[PDB]
Each structure stands twice: as structure tokens, then as C-alpha cells.
RNA sequence: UUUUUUUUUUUUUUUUUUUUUUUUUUCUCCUCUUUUUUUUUUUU
């Protein structure tokens, strides 16, 4: 019953779909877009991913 | 004491040509464990 309910509310897409540069530009001069190096976890591998400015990724 | 006649190896040579490696499939796919991540230093 779950099997349905997450397969359909999954649809047609898997990840955001990235986007033009001017827009980087200007949401960093604007202020707000951080940006800096980023690793990951290697106990944990799929889950603990910071992005070193930590910002945890899960 | 036994004469005379019954052809034979197809004829021919003095024709133009402006393309080009290959060639045509097989789907989506759960990476297990003390961690933040340690870090100067000196002898190559």
C-alpha cells in the first residue's frame, strides 16, 4: 500500500534541475548564496556530507 | 587368266566506360558502523 503511494509521488524527475549563471551572480551579490568546499563522511558516506563554509547535507 | 573410279583439317577481327574506410539496437540497478576529519616540529 506504501509501494503505490511512494511511486506516485515520485513522478518523472529524480534531482532540481540546475539553472543559468546570471542568476548566481546576482543571488550572491544580493546576498544570498554562500559558497565554499564541500566534503563528506567516509563511515557514513551517503548521509554526512558537509559543506565547509557546517552546513550538514542529508 | 581378276580391269576403271569414288574432293578436303570454320570464315572473321584495327572495342567506349567519368569511383573510395564503414554500413544496423538491448532496460532500470541498497557501496555495513570509534569519530570530529588529523595537521607545528626536526632529521631525505
Redesign the pocket.
Known amino acids: 500500500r506504501e509501494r503505490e503511494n511512494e511511486s506516485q509521488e515520485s513522478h518523472g524527475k529524480?534531482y532540481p534541475e540546475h539553472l543559468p549563471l546570471e542568476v548566481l551572480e546576482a543571488g550572491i551579490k544580493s546576498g544570498r548564496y554562500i559558497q565554499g568546499i564541500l566534503?563528506?563522511?567516509?563511515?557514513?558516506?551517503?548521509i554526512?556530507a558537509?559543506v565547509r563554509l557546517?552546513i550538514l547535507i542529508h
Open positions: 529524480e566534503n563528506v563522511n567516509k563511515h557514513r558516506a551517503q554526512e558537509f557546517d
